[PDB]
Design a binder for this molecule. Sequence first.
Ligand SMILES: [Mg+2]
Ligand SMILES: [Mg+2]
Ligand SMILES: [Mg+2]
Ligand SMILES: [Mg+2]
Lengths: 173, 172, 173, 173
Amino acid sequence: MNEIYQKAKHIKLFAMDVDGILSDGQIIYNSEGTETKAFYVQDGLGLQALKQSGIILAIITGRSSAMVDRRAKELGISHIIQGQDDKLTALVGLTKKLGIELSHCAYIGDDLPDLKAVREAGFGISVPNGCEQTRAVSDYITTKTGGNGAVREVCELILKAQNNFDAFIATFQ
Amino acid sequence: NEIYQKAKHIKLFAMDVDGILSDGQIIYNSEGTETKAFYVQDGLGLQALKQSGIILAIITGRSSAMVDRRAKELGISHIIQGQDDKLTALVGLTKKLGIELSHCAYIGDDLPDLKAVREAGFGISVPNGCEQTRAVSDYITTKTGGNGAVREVCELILKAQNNFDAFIATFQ
Amino acid sequence: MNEIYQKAKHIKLFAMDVDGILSDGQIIYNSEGTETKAFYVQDGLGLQALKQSGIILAIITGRSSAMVDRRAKELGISHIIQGQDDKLTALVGLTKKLGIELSHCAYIGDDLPDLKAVREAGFGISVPNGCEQTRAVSDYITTKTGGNGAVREVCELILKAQNNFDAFIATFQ
Amino acid sequence: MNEIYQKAKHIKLFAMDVDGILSDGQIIYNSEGTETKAFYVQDGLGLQALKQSGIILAIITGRSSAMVDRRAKELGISHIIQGQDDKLTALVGLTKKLGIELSHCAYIGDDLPDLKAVREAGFGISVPNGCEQTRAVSDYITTKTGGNGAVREVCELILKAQNNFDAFIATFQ
Ligand SMILES: [Mg+2]
Ligand SMILES: [Mg+2]
Ligand SMILES: [Mg+2]
Ligand SMILES: [Mg+2]
């Protein structure tokens, strides 16, 4: 632990990849030209509690979709960078816009495009379903899988390492 | 006998939706539609609980036509949507049905479900559920949510009430 | 173990439950009131093969749906019985219509309403995902699960029992 | 795990089955006549990397749908054959239309229609969800299942055999 917690303690921004992280990775099409994407419910409460404890939420995704716009809005995710292959540059751009540093950003991804941003963020996360190279470069690997609570699990970890986890639990107790 | 005694006197069984009746997936498409999946074997269990005289209810923080439909075809008379404070709703039910909290079962999977699982006469959770709800529950299912969790529990309550073998005999 | 083949060798009618057998048990709804159901692709080739060796196929379900009609018609399943509580009566009513005895009927099912039909058919089949009572009265239980190959495997098993499997494989070699 | 690298060394075309390879083999229908098919995100980045290494791509499937077109175009798959059960016929047709030896063709599939093309290609591949006959005929079985990164797995494998794996990764480091 130790190193993980200090990295997580100084986080002001959590920035997410969509496919493989917020969803399990299925790109779903149908015979009328419609697209579908699945998200996990427990991820929703975790993100909410990070917003309310003071952390700014962001999405950086290489694909563009309405489903992502619809989920981000309802979740209180504030910055939505769609159609962006270069994750680092978007993350650096938010850092200058919000007036923080890479060291104050947490980043979670699952594939090669995320690699630099996971490497250069203060706290870089990946998932079991994530590829070999991106996992080698991360400060933490989740126990749960993309679209099955990987985000929630890291939400609770940042909350713990900020001694904010009990405030959150107690509102339901 | 710990679990069987708590369940022996259930007069109403009430349920969370997402994570319980579904595997907790929330599905959206590019034309503004939402989708939810349920498990067939749950329906049979729930219907069997109905027939023995147990009242059924749903209490969920989200809101959808899918939940109305499933509940209608399953004889679920109390459908409470857009409601995150599960314990107030359940107590609201308890009183207006003329029953007690000790005669209530409630199954749930996340923190909004905590207090209701704690205060319900028979509190239930699931493997996929979080640790704080689970620590507070009288029983945990082997099968996951949207995978027989509810059916398992339905069978549990019937056995407790001397009603399982007779339900089985209807299909023999 | 080998009592299994004598049962399988005189099958002229293979009748299937739908949910838990042709599907994994997911009943799917949406906000426009639509319903959806998933089928396994490999089950097709196996029902195609049983139909070719001269076996007549049937579906008995306590549930409606045009999805059943669509899948059934693409596999050439002639007899489709939907909205049926009592499967055993449906099955028997179907044997009288044909020149068939219960002994020449195979039937596969996952839950209690399938119990009598699985028990009285000459070759009753169930699945790892079926309830306990239905499994304890079947003559065979599949390795693969509903909507994941249960049907294909039992299709292969009957073909082997009727000396039609080896000829069937060969056509793809 | 050594015979595989030489077989793959000379591949100038990777051709693919759809159902059971690019998807998990679910065939999805709803009550408005709409068919749905699911794909895997990490496969795309695998395919475009191959295509960028100078390898032509192809699909050969027994079914027909708008989804396969939408996905194939999206991933730069130029040769798309639909409504064809003779996979070995179609592939040969492609090999001679493009002027390439069959020893240079890699082909992946899950079931019996695929078995001849798998066996006769310079690099035939199957997956764990696939049948026994087609598995026993393949040069390589994937660890990852159809619709869950099987295509991505082989994609990287071909790159490693061709000495383009390192250059592919560098672009994200
Ligand atoms: Mg991703
Ligand atoms: Mg829930
Ligand atoms: Mg069934
Ligand atoms: Mg196939």
